[PDB]
Symmetry: C7
Subunit: 70 residues, 7 copies
């Protein structure tokens, strides 16, 4: 709907999304949940730098978000 841009997050549940953060971080992961604050829960998340690190479950606070690429 033209007035609910966060509904696009719902269409991406159980896919990999890229959450860009204000501080320049890129957080990629499997979107498990999101709310109207754009808080999100990401499964098996990875931070673009530094790499190698692995996050079974990551809850990202919405206010840190720049944009989400679905």
């Amino acid at each position: 709907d033209t007035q609910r841009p966060l509904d696009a997050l719902g269409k991406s549940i159980n896919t990999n999304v890229t959450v860009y953060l204000k501080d320049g971080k890129l957080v990629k992961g499997r979107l498990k949940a999101y709310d109207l604050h754009m808080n999100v829960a990401l499964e098996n998340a990875k931070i673009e730098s530094d790499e190698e690190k692995e996050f079974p479950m990551l809850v990202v606070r919405g206010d840190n978000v720049l944009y989400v690429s679905l």
Copy 2:
């Protein structure tokens, strides 16, 4: 309406807009949705300085927005 500046986003649904962000980024895309926080959903979005990177769907958190060119 002189009291509803965001109604101008409603008249630009499915057009190309440029969202200027507080950090200097320019995001161009087709406006699919917006809410009263100025969250916007941009289809086939593009950010300058990174040309050939393209985002099929970018959900932009309103609090990062400087202004929106319609």
Copy 3:
């Protein structure tokens, strides 16, 4: 009314105003609309050419508005 400072924008609708932003930008343009957040819609706007038919400015960026 001494308690409605934003009514000054209502009296400036369809006139040229200058929006000063927190970053030092001066956005000039014709005021079409505003809200209690101080979001504004500016018609035929400039940032001192590069011109914008319609620019919707988010209120939390505003320093002050010259009417």
Copy 4:
């Protein structure tokens, strides 16, 4: 009343005040209106960045305010 600090602005309506801003600016002008966000309307406003432009009418966003000298 001791629970209403912004009533001091009410006692200074139509007098000259100095609005100190977070960024170090000082704005002087005659106080025509204020609200509970500390938004203020200033007539014949001068900013000490230049002492020759008298803005007929300046509306200052309250969240930029450090303090107001009455």
Copy 5:
């Protein structure tokens, strides 16, 4: 009451307090009023490092406050 920290401000009404600001300023003055945002009204306010800068009445926006010394 142990759930109303700002009631301590109430016990300092019409006495001298020091308001520490986020940016490192100290503002001293006689507390006339305060609200739940920690906006405060100060009579005969002085800033510590500007000895001669005197203010008959200063209204301080509370979101600049670090803490208040009573």
Copy 6:
């Protein structure tokens, strides 16, 4: 539930979590409580900037939170 990202915190009650803060700090501890602001009470908590002290109870203010690793 796909609309309740913070329920992942409720499942992590009485387990060890890592709270990443906006300033780069990492706070690690046993999660006893959280709220919809992402305030969290952490028992026997450790700062990686000091991984020797074991604070009996740390209440972290959620507005500082970048993401929590669960």
Copy 7:
């Protein structure tokens, strides 16, 4: 209660706590009051940086708080 993290502050009333602020300050004193914004009233407070200044009663604005150590 697992959804009331600030209740831990209520358990610490009239004991000595240490409030960590975002600017790196540590404020120690006896907790007399708190509220849901994490404003706190600290009696006979001390700041680690300047351990010679007494603060008989300090009201600290919650938005400056990093975490409280109980």
